[PDB]
């Protein structure tokens, strides 16, 4: 019929075993299981990759990578511009698109049902339904960890000289 | 990270075996998470992954196990720009003045009043990429500036790449799939399969420059320091094109290091060079792999791996769980001799006793000798010419070794280094009796758990990084997802742990359960077959669905 469906088994220590008939159902299971354990972590890291840390937390805080909120936000706003995200999505295979669509839907399903049993950030304005673009933002953040990501502060600091001697 | 793949010629069962020991953060966007994925008939893979990714990053399947370590290859280049003498916002390529591009981003900032303000920021860009400034080294003055070209910005293949790896049957298939797509951004890949092949690949996305361009296109001062820096005023220094590469400007797969053997391969973040010393990997671009002295983790691994005795699963496990501080093997014997030559030097007395009684480990019950040794090494690192036997490229596994105590200046500086280290240790708040496990911990809510292991720079295979917080050292990264895989007839047997546990949320039943196990170094079955899964008395099942 449609659309997304997954069978999840958990063994000791909360390890999920996800079975599905296609990538979309598989992603659904992954997103739901991961949310049960780590919704707050993902939401925080998505705020970072969206360049919204200063909006929620102010200029005095840092990301989990220990970058100041504003320079981090400038870097991720630069990296994850709409045109970059859309080019990236357009280059994805149907299978990968489906994995990501399922993941977002599964994470969101858990959020709809969450009553705080395994989620400490219930009620925070930054804990919100996610989109496939948010997963692209996280992916690109990881992609550049071996490159321009290590120069985030240096990019933000790059300004032309003044009148100095 | 460590990785060891063992093949049919060395494994006790004549089949493949893989130890995966990545060293990664215990929190945040790189926190590993275990999962098993199955689309019956065509996908069945288990391992661990990074947050947000719907694929397995390090794992195993019916006939194959693989893992990754961060490589030494460059994945970007800096470009030194020659600025227009009339305008520092313009730069010269082949003598022609080009304008920088400007891209403004706007950010909302929550103020003290709790309201949002808008902040705009200009990002300057060249044809190579954005400009970057490191004050005092990479400045933007009226003569020069630096731009950065990141090779992975155009790597749209990265998710596809791991999904493809997740579908791989054996080592040959894995190699085909990685070489075909070239979507791996910044790690090596090591793998073993049931038939007993052991594979190392330095197959990642690396800027390509034809060999004849490198001498003139490099910035000599900067590459000497290990920065991949090129001359950005010459159009001939653009990354080279080769139709065989999966992406314009990257190095084709055939020019990247691969070693396929039946004995072993290993990597602990050094270059491809001594993956297996019996078959050194040489002759590659400096952007890819260089013959640099290996670090103590690799030197430790090779000391255990070399030779003719069969390797058992237990052997690989215990290379991790022994917590041996391998750097001590090079300096501790001569250091203790200095201690013996200096009894009655009251300032060295406590340090010398602690070092002498020390088990040379980073175990929970290792004594304060480890702490003294760490602080001494931090200072020894920085002394000039103090090795008795300095690095010998003809003996890259056995050097450097020893302290040059027969040189009076060295003996003087080494003793002073120990005196200073001892002083530092003793003016810290460390009690009497205290063992390493009393000091290094992972906080869980209102409680702590003692964590074994120590910094990888001291040659501890079980690498653990911690930072001082209050009365303790708080673990921030290191050993994370552990998997040790063998292939008996029934199906793959995987054993390991996720050191920091599945959940980062203090409310979860899975916030500290594996962390208690990691403390006691008690690895567990990673159940993969339906039979293994059904045998778990903790088994729970949920089926979920919703409309598209
Ligand atoms: B070690 O200390 O060298 C750490 C290496 C482990 C990191 C392996 C992660 C697998 C890479 C996934 C990248 C995905 C990018 C989107």
Distance CA B249, CA B242 (A): 7
Give helix A94-113 / helix A23-49 axis angle, nearest 10°: 70
Give helix B158-166 / helix B171-181 axis angle, nearest 10°: 170
Nearest to A96 among B112, B123, B160 (CB): B160
The answer to whether B192 and B199 are in contact (CB under 8 A) is yes
The reply to whether CATH 3.40.50.300 applies to domain B1-75+151-290+475-536 is no
Give helix A132-143 / helix B158-166 axis angle, nearest 10°: 90
Nearest Cα to B295, choosing from B266, B258, B259, B257?
B266
Task: Report how far ligand 1's centroid is from the alpha carbon of B69 (Å).
Answer: 6
Burial A55-69 (b: 16+ CB within 10 A, else e): bbbebeeebbbebbb
Domain regions of chain B by residue span: 1-75+151-290+475-536, 76-150, 293-474
User: Which residues on neighbouring strands pair with residue B469, listed in sequence order?
Assistant: B472
Reported resolution, Å = 1.8
3-state secondary structure of A29: helix
Q: How many CB atoms lie within 10 A of CB B271?
A: 24
Sign of CA dihedral A95, A97, A103, A109: negative
The answer to whether B91 and B84 are in contact (CB under 8 A) is yes
DSSP code for B319: H
Distance CA B200, CA B313 (A): 19
Nearest Cα to B492, choosing from B16, B121, B97?
B16
CATH of domain B293-474: 1.10.1400.10
Distance CA B142, CA B9 (A): 61
Alpha carbon separation from B546 to A96, B288, B523 (Å, rounded): 20, 47, 37
The answer to whether B155 and B180 are in contact (CB under 8 A) is no
**CA closest to B91 among chain A residues:** A160
The answer to whether B187 and B68 are in contact (CB under 8 A) is yes
B96 token code pair: 């022609």
Alpha carbon separation from B356 to A56, B337, B338, B376 (Å, rounded): 53, 10, 12, 14
CB pairs under 8 A between A and B: 298
Task: Report how far ligand 1's centroid is from the alpha carbon of A94 (Å).
Answer: 24
Sign of CA dihedral B526, B532, B535, B539: positive
**Touching A: B residues 97-156, CB under 8 Å:** 103, 105-112, 116, 119, 121-124, 129-135, 138, 140-142, 145, 148, 150-153, 155-156
The answer to whether B37 and A26 are in contact (CB under 8 A) is yes
Nearest Cα to A68, choosing from A55, A54, A82?
A54
Distance CA B335, CA B415 (A): 9
B54 token code pair: 């719907």
Question: Which residues of B are catalytically annotated?
Answer: 1
Alpha carbon separation from A76 to A91, A144, A149, B187 (Å, rounded): 20, 11, 9, 23
Question: Which residues have CB under 6 Å of ligand 1?
Answer: A 139, 142-143; B 1, 22-24, 50, 57, 68-70, 158, 185, 187, 269
Sign of CA dihedral A136, A137, A138, A144: positive
What does A70-90 look like in DSSP terms, one character per residue? HHHHHHHHHHT-HHHHHHHHH
Kind plus residue range of the DSSP H or E element containing B49: strand B43-49
Kind plus residue range of the DSSP H or E element containing B423: helix B408-426
Alpha carbon separation from B26 to A14, B37, B178, B368, B499 (Å, rounded): 17, 23, 28, 25, 8
The answer to whether B324 and B360 are in contact (CB under 8 A) is yes
Q: Which phi and psi angles does B274 have, rounded to 5°? A: -110, 35
The answer to whether B112 and B171 are in contact (CB under 8 A) is no
The answer to whether B112 and B241 are in contact (CB under 8 A) is no
Distance CA B481, CA B494 (A): 12
| Residue whose structure tokens are 């000039």 | B384
Nearest Cα to B158, choosing from B61, B44, B66, B49?
B49
B76-150 shares its CATH topology with B293-474:
no
- Give CA torsion, residues A40, A41, A46, A47, to 10 deg: 70
Distance CA B91, CA B485 (A): 54
The answer to whether B455 and B464 are in contact (CB under 8 A) is yes
- Three-state SS string across chain A, please? CCCEEEEEEEEHHHEEEEECCCHHHHHHHHHHHHHHHHHHHHHHHHHHHCCCHHHHHCCCCECCCCCEHHHHHHHHHHHCCHHHHHHHHHCCCHHHHHHHHHHHHHHHHHHHHCCCCCCCCCCCCCCCCCCHHHHHHHHHHHHHHHCHHHHHHHHHHCCCCCCCC
Give the full edge-to-edge strand order of the sheet including B33-39.
B258-261, B198-201, B187-193, B64-70, B58-60, B43-49, B33-39, A15-19, A4-11, B540-546
Integer-rounded Cα radius of gyration of chain A: 18
The atom number, within ligand 1, closest to the CA of B158 reads 16
Distance CA B163, CA B37 (A): 11
B313 token code pair: 């699963």
The atom number, within ligand 1, closest to the CA of B69 reads 3
DSSP code for A151: G
Distance CA B262, CA B540 (A): 40
Cβ distance of B34 and A28 shorter than 8 Å:
no
Distance CA B520, CA B342 (A): 38
B330 token code pair: 């090079």
B542 token code pair: 């949920």
3-state helix, strand, coil split of chain B in percent (to 5) is: 25, 30, 45
3-state secondary structure of A113: helix
Residue numbers after which chain B is interrupted (C to N above 2.5 A) read: none
Task: Report how far ligand 1's centroid is from the alpha carbon of B106 (Å).
Answer: 31
Q: How many CB atoms lie within 10 A of CB B268?
A: 24
**CA closest to B149 among chain A residues:** A148
| Residue whose structure tokens are 């390509």 | B208
- Say how many CA atoms lie within 13 Å of B200 toward its Cβ: 31
DSSP code for A10: E
- Three-state SS string across B70-127, please? ECCCCCEEEEEEEEECCEEEEEEECCEEEECEEEEEEEEEECCCCCEEEEEEEEEEEC
Peptide bond into B152 cis (omega under 30): no
Instruction: Give the architecture-level CATH label for domain A1-165.
Output: Orthogonal Bundle (1.10)
User: Which residues on neighbouring strands pair with residue B62, listed in sequence order?
Assistant: none
3-state secondary structure of B261: strand
**Which of A135, A140, A143, A148 has the most ligand 1 atoms within 8 A of CB, as the residue to mutate?**
A143
- Give CA torsion, residues B316, B453, B2, B389, to 10 deg: -100
Cβ distance of A78 and B29 shorter than 8 Å:
no
CATH of domain B76-150: 2.30.120.10
3-state secondary structure of B182: coil
Distance CA B146, CA B154 (A): 20
Q: Supply the residue whose CA is at minimum distance from atom 6 of ligand 1.
A: B22
By what method was this entry solved? X-ray
Alpha helices in B184-312 (DSSP H): 214-217, 220-223, 296-305
Cβ distance of B150 and A148 shorter than 8 Å:
yes
Kindly state whether A3 is in contact with chain B, defined as any CB-CB distance less than 8 angstroms.
yes
Kind plus residue range of the DSSP H or E element containing A155: helix A152-157
Q: Which phi and psi angles does B291 have, rounded to 5°? A: -85, 75
Kind plus residue range of the DSSP H or E element containing B178: helix B171-181
Distance CA A35, CA A111 (A): 8
The answer to whether B227 and B237 are in contact (CB under 8 A) is no
Q: Which phi and psi angles does B537 have, rounded to 5°? A: -70, -15
Residue to test with chain A: of B52, B116, B516, B530, most A Cβ within 10 A? B52
B306 token code pair: 């070399």
Q: What is the total residue count of chain B?
A: 548
Cβ distance of B148 and A155 shorter than 8 Å:
yes
Strands B472-479, B440-444: parallel, antiparallel or unpaired by DSSP? parallel
- Three-state SS string across B18-47, please? EEEECEEECCHHHCCEEEEEEECCCEEEEE
**What number of helices (H) and strands (E) belong to chain A?**
7, 2
DSSP code for B511: S
Alpha carbon separation from B172 to B161, B180, B201, B431 (Å, rounded): 16, 12, 12, 55
Domain regions of chain A by residue span: 1-165
Distance CA B85, CA A76 (A): 33
Integer-rounded Cα radius of gyration of chain B: 26
Distance CA B267, CA B4 (A): 7
Kind plus residue range of the DSSP H or E element containing B335: helix B327-340
């Amino acid at each position: 019929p449609t659309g997304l469906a997954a069978d999840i088994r958990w063994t000791a220590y909360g390890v999920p075993h996800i079975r599905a008939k296609d990538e979309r159902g598989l992603g659904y299971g992954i997103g739901y299981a991961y949310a049960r354990d780590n919704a707050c972590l993902l939401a925080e890291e998505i705020v970072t990759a969206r360049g919204e840390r200063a909006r929620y937390f102010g200029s005095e805080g840092k990301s989990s990578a220990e970058l100041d909120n504003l320079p981090s936000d400038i870097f991720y706003a630069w990296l994850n511009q709409p045109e970059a995200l859309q080019a990236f999505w357009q280059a994805q295979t149907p299978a990968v698109r489906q994995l990501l669509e399922g993941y977002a839907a599964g994470f969101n399903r858990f959020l709809r049902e969450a009553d705080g049993k395994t989620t400490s950030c219930l009620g925070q304005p930054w804990l919100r339904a996610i989109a496939t673009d948010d997963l692209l933002r996280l992916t690109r953040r990881l992609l550049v960890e071996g490159g321009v990501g290590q120069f985030a502060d240096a990019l933000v600091a790059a300004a032309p000289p003044g009148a100095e001697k | 990270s460590n990785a060891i793949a063992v093949g049919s010629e060395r494994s006790a069962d004549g089949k493949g075996m893989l130890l995966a020991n990545p060293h990664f953060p215990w929190n945040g966007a790189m926190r590993f998470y275990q999962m098993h994925l199955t689309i019956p008939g065509r996908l069945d893979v288990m391992g661990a992954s990074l947050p947000g990714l719907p694929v397995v990053n390090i794992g195993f399947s019916r006939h194959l196990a693989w893992t990754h370590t961060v490589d030494t290859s460059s994945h970007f280049t800096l470009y030194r720009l020659a600025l227009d003498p009339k305008d520092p916002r313009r730069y010269l390529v082949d003598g022609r003045s080009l304008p920088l591009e400007e891209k403004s981003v706007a950010i909302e900032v929550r103020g003290a009043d709790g309201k949002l303000s808008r902040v705009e920021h200009k990002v300057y860009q060249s044809i190579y990429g954005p400009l970057v400034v490191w004050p005092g080294k990479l400045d933007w003055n009226r003569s020069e500036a630096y731009a950065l070209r990141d090779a992975n910005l155009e790597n749209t293949r990265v998710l596809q790449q791991w999904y493809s790896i997740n579908q791989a049957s054996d080592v040959a298939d894995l190699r085909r799939r990685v070489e075909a797509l070239q979507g791996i951004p910044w790690v090596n890949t090591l793998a073993a399969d049931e038939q007993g092949n052991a594979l190392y690949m330095n197959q990642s996305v690396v800027p390509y420059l034809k060999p004849e361009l490198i001498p003139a296109c490099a910035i000599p001062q900067l590459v000497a320091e290990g920065l991949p820096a090129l001359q950005g005023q010459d159009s001939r220094c653009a990354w080279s094109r080769d139709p065989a590469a999966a992406q314009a400007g990257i190095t084709p797969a055939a020019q990247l290091p691969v070693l396929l053997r039946r004995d072993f391969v290993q990597n602990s973040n050094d270059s491809a060079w001594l993956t297996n010393p019996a078959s050194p990997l040489q002759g590659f671009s400096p952007l890819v792999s260089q013959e640099k002295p290996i670090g103590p983790r690799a030197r430790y691994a090779l000391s255990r791996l070399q030779g003719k005795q069969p390797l058992e699963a237990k052997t690989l496990e215990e290379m991790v769980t022994a917590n041996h501080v391998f750097s001590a093997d090079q300096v501790l014997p001569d250091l203790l001799r200095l201690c013996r030559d200096n009894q009655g030097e009251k300032s060295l007395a406590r340090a010398c006793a602690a070092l002498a009684q020390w088990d040379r480990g980073a175990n929970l019950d290792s004594g304060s000798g480890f702490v003294y040794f760490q602080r001494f090494m931090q200072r020894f690192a920085e002394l000039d010419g103090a090795w008795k036997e300095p690095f010998d490229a003809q003996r890259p596994l056995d050097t450097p070794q020893g302290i040059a105590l027969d040189r009076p200046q060295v003996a003087t500086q080494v003793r002073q280094a120990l005196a200073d280290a001892a002083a530092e240790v003793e003016k810290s708040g460390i009690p009497d009796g205290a063992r390493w496990g009393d000091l290094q911990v992972s906080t869980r809510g209102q409680e702590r758990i003692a964590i074994p292991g120590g910094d990888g720079h001291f040659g501890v295979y079980n690498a653990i990084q911690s930072v001082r917080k209050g009365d303790h050292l708080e673990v921030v990264g290191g050993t994370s997802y552990i998997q040790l895989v063998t292939f008996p007839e029934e199906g793959p047997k995987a054993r390991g742990l996720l050191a920091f546990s599945q959940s980062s949320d203090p409310r979860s039943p899975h916030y500290r359960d594996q962390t208690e196990l990691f403390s006691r170094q008690q690895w567990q079955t990673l159940p993969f077959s339906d039979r293994q899964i059904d045998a778990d008395p903790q088994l729970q099942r949920l089926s979920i669905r919703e409309a598209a």
